[PDB]
């Protein structure tokens, strides 16, 4: 196998530093069942 230097797309240069990061959104609203009822 033969390997040669490349590049061109500068987006690759950022991937070498952003490989350990990703964006997520927090959705704090979660419903769950339990034996608890409110008042009347």
């Amino acid at each position: 196998e033969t390997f040669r230097p490349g590049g061109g797309d500068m987006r690759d240069n950022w991937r070498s530093e952003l490989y350990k990061y990703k964006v997520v959104k927090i959705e704090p609203l979660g419903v769950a069942p339990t034996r608890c009822k409110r008042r009347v």
Partner: protein
């Protein structure tokens, strides 16, 4: 009793993969470099002196460096950065003599 009832919880550790608008941060010593705003750091938010990193125990999340949007956002930032820095600069239109 034995029959369950729903209960609303606010502040649960629940997240999903998405894309948003990220902002910048670049220390406080970098702003002291001045020289009429070098590169980008002009109205950039000063970096938190004591950053916090919370290790999420028992958590296994899948990453994808090739399908990460932070790159496509950063790339469009540096490009736009290049244009804004050349707008108030001297145009060499009559140098094609």
């Amino acid at each position: 009793a034995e029959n369950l009832w729903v209960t609303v919880y606010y502040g649960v550790p629940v997240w999903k993969d998405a894309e948003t608008t990220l902002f910048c941060a670049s220390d406080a010593k970098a702003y002291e470099t001045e020289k009429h705003n070098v590169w980008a750091t002009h109205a950039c938010v000063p970096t938190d002196p004591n950053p916090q990193e919370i290790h999420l125990e028992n958590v296994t999340e899948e990453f994808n460096m090739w399908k990460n949007n932070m790159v496509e956002q950063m790339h469009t930032d540096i490009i736009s950065l290049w244009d804004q820095s050349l707008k108030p600069c001297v145009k060499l239109t009559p140098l094609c003599v």
